[PDB]
């Protein structure tokens, strides 16, 4: 419901005003979910954090292998609207845990997802994400995942993957961003902007009515929210010549409580958009 439409000059100055950024940010309700919503034996095992749960109206429900079982059907994931409110542009989800690797691949297959964006640093693979792709090939619950190529670039690692289940084969692009900064200073913005632009281009290459793009980080709200907000605001800047990070953050929180978890993250999105505006203007 909140909105602050930024032209270029205000955007550049806003990104460098931490006192106003924190005043604005902490006015936005988190919209977290009451745990009573998911009173199911065994459900805690499927969540990394007891208080970060999928809002029920936008939750992704797994339809295989038992849609009548609420535990089997549960994954900590929500559909996320994109630019202009387009439905189901993204799915935001937690990094898989050991017990949810197969569920994650069930979601990828169910949703026809063509692109995964993973935002976890290499030193965080003991806490913030279980390595869920194979060196060559693995099958989780009837989804056969084959890594055909690993492309290492400075700003991300891209895996080209083939998914086979039955007689059907589909491609998948897995982008792993490992450059998330400890201090969210402007000099750390270029790699994230590059990732956003690369993924935007890959999404367009999927053609009309692209299926949902899965984005994840540890809890599926902080870095994930930054990535999605930046992606939406880049389209807004190109189409409208302005950025409304506040409105975008409010929209994201409606879809999944907690999106953009910290004020440092909120400021980082402003640094990224300020950088992009400078690039576009040249």
From Swiss-Prot:
Q: Where is this protein found?
A: Endoplasmic reticulum membrane
Q: Which cysteines are joined by disulfide bonds?
A: none
* Catalytic residue list: 217
Query: Which residues of this UniProt protein bind substrate?
Result: 182, 217-223, 261
- Residue ranges annotated for the Tyrosine-protein phosphatase domain, each copy included: 21-276
Q: Return the similarity comment.
A: Belongs to the protein-tyrosine phosphatase family. Non-receptor class subfamily.
Function (record text): May regulate the activity of several effector molecules involved in synaptic plasticity and neuronal cell survival, including MAPKs, Src family kinases and NMDA receptors.
Listed name of the protein? Tyrosine-protein phosphatase non-receptor type 5
Organism (species): Homo sapiens
The range of the complete sequence contained here reads 282 to 561 of 565
